[PDB]
């Protein structure tokens, strides 16, 4: 269809079959991308633990669609999880640059559970937690039942020892034990790199992980540069009956009786107290001014999350492809052939001297 670059070229970075707070292994990703056009190295160690590493084969324009993961379900099965946010932008990728793609994974669900007492709470036979809510208007002892927030997807590269974020798609927040929202949190999108990507507010439930921060709370979702491993349940949930509902990989915040905050460039706020009806807030996404925003941040991801990097060249006079991209003004020239630049007059591409 297109003479120059073929828009059928697409790599699909998935969770490699993995789910919960721990990132994919090398063996999982080798089976996942078995006989595909995609080949990656998964980090076993450091902040790169669970992060897939893909090399750009040649300097060319590729559109990166990141899909952050959905939050976990709470102690109420009727309540729908907050679906993960996607960011579609068209970027110029440089030869030999290693792109680090962390696919954010769905947050762990609270109900059903293998524990006897907790399973009665999950089927609604035993509302011992509602009994505590009645006397205190908050949960202090019977903590648990909030699903951990969904982990965000971080797609970046390394340049001169500095990680440069390209596409970060936010994860949706987990549902509380007393999950009572009918409206999910509007898709949050950043496009300015000067805005520090810190974690979300963490109270009793853990807030989402950001780009870079220092997580002190065991239940709070860790940032990208801390490995972005999803935070644990609140200490009371872990103590009482061991109800561990961690956030998903990619900065998923941990669940208490309140829902965990979803990951992002900036993490999503979880509840300030252990209010069992405070559902976790979604994270903030990101897109670098290095690329052209194809479409605003959109909730599309139902569960585990993913990334699709494809060749899409969006030109008003050639919309799927069939044009070249001038990186400096971030403008596409639909006339430019091999070894030509547009004329300085605004008239057609002449042979570049």
UniProtKB/Swiss-Prot annotation:
Give the molecular function GO annotations.
ATP binding; heparin binding; identical protein binding; protein tyrosine kinase activity; receptor signaling protein tyrosine kinase activator activity; transmembrane receptor protein tyrosine kinase activity
Cite the record's tissue specificity text.
Expressed in brain and CNS. Also expressed in the small intestine and testis, but not in normal lymphoid cells.
Q: Which GO terms describe its cellular component?
A: extracellular exosome; plasma membrane; protein-containing complex; receptor complex
Spell out where the chain is glycosylated: 37, 136, 191-192, 214, 314
Its primary localisation, in coarse terms, equals membrane
Biological processes annotated in GO: adult behavior; cell surface receptor protein tyrosine kinase signaling pathway; energy homeostasis; hippocampus development; negative regulation of lipid catabolic process; neuron development; peptidyl-tyrosine autophosphorylation; phosphorylation
Q: Where in the cell is it found?
A: Cell membrane
Positions of the region EGF-like? 315-353
Q: Name the UniProt key words of this record, in alphabetical order.
A: ATP-binding, Cell membrane, Chromosomal rearrangement, Disease variant, Disulfide bond, Glycoprotein, Kinase, Membrane, Nucleotide-binding, Phosphoprotein, Proto-oncogene, Receptor, Repeat, Signal, Transferase, Transmembrane, Transmembrane helix, Tyrosine-protein kinase
Q: Which domain of life is it from?
A: Eukaryota
State what changing residue 205 to S does.
In an ovarian serous carcinoma sample; somatic mutation
Question: What PTMs does it carry?
Answer: Phosphorylated at tyrosine residues by autocatalysis, which activates kinase activity. In cells not stimulated by a ligand, receptor protein tyrosine phosphatase beta and zeta complex (PTPRB/PTPRZ1) dephosphorylates ALK at the sites in ALK that are undergoing autophosphorylation through autoactivation. N-glycosylated.
Q: Which family does it belong to?
A: Belongs to the protein kinase superfamily. Tyr protein kinase family. Insulin receptor subfamily.
| Subunit structure, interactors included | Homodimer; homodimerizes following heparin- and ligand-binding. Interacts with CBL, IRS1, PIK3R1 and PLCG1. Interacts with FRS2 and SHC1. Interacts with PTN and MDK.
Q: Domain text from the record?
A: The EGF-like region drives the cytokine specificity for ALKAL2.
What disease association does UniProt give? Answer: A chromosomal aberration involving ALK is found in a form of non-Hodgkin lymphoma. Translocation t(2;5)(p23;q35) with NPM1. The resulting chimeric NPM1-ALK protein homodimerize and the kinase becomes constitutively activated. The constitutively active fusion proteins are responsible for 5-10% of non-Hodgkin lymphomas.
Role description = Neuronal receptor tyrosine kinase that is essentially and transiently expressed in specific regions of the central and peripheral nervous systems and plays an important role in the genesis and differentiation of the nervous system. Also acts as a key thinness protein involved in the resistance to weight gain: in hypothalamic neurons, controls energy expenditure acting as a negative regulator of white adipose tissue lipolysis and sympathetic tone to fine-tune energy homeostasis.
What is the recorded name of this protein? ALK tyrosine kinase receptor
Q: Which organism is it from?
A: Homo sapiens (Human)
Gene symbol of the encoding locus:
ALK
């Amino acid at each position: 269809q297109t003479p120059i670059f073929d828009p059928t070229v697409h790599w699909l970075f998935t969770t490699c079959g993995a789910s919960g707070p721990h990132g994919p292994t090398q063996a999982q990703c080798n089976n996942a991308y078995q006989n595909s056009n995609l080949s990656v190295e998964v980090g076993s160690e450091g902040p790169l633990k669970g992060i897939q590493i893909w090399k750009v084969p040649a300097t060319d324009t590729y559109s990166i669609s990141g899909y952050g993961a959905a939050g976990g379900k709470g102690g109420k099965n009727t309540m729908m999880r907050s679906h993960g946010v996607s960011v579609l932008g068209i970027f110029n990728l440089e030869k030999d640059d290693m792109l680090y793609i962390l696919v954010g994974q769905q947050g762990e669900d609270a109900c059903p559970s293998t524990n006897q007492l907790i399973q009665k709470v999950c089927i609604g036979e035993n509302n011992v937690i509602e009994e505590e809510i009645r006397v205190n208007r908050s949960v202090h002892e019977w903590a648990g039942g909030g699903g951990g927030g969904g982990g965000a997807t971080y797609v970046f590269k390394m340049k001169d020892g500095v990680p440069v974020p390209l596409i970060i798609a936010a994860g949706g927040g987990g549902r509380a034990y007393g999950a009572k929202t009918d409206t999910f949190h509007p898709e949050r999108l950043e496009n300015n790199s000067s805005v520090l990507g810190l974690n979300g507010n963490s109270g009793a439930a853990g807030g989402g992980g950001g780009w870079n921060d220092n997580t002190s709370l065991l239940w709070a979702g860790k940032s990208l540069q801390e490995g972005a491993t999803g935070g644990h349940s609140c200490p009371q949930a872990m103590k009482k009956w061991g109800w561990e509902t961690r956030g998903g990989f990619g900065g998923g915040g941990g669940g208490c009786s309140s829902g965990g905050g979803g990951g992002g460039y900036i993490g999503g706020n979880a509840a300030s107290n252990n209010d069992p009806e405070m559902d976790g807030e979604d994270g903030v996404s990101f897109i670098s001014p290095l690329g052209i925003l194809y479409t605003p941040a959109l909730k599309v991801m139902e569960g585990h999350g993913e990334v699709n990097i494809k060749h899409y060249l969006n030109c008003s006079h050639c919309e799927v492809d069939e044009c070249h991209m001038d990186p400096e003004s971030h403008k596409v020239i639909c006339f430019c052939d091999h070894g030509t630049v547009l004329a300085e007059d605004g008239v057609s591409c002449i042979v570049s001297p």
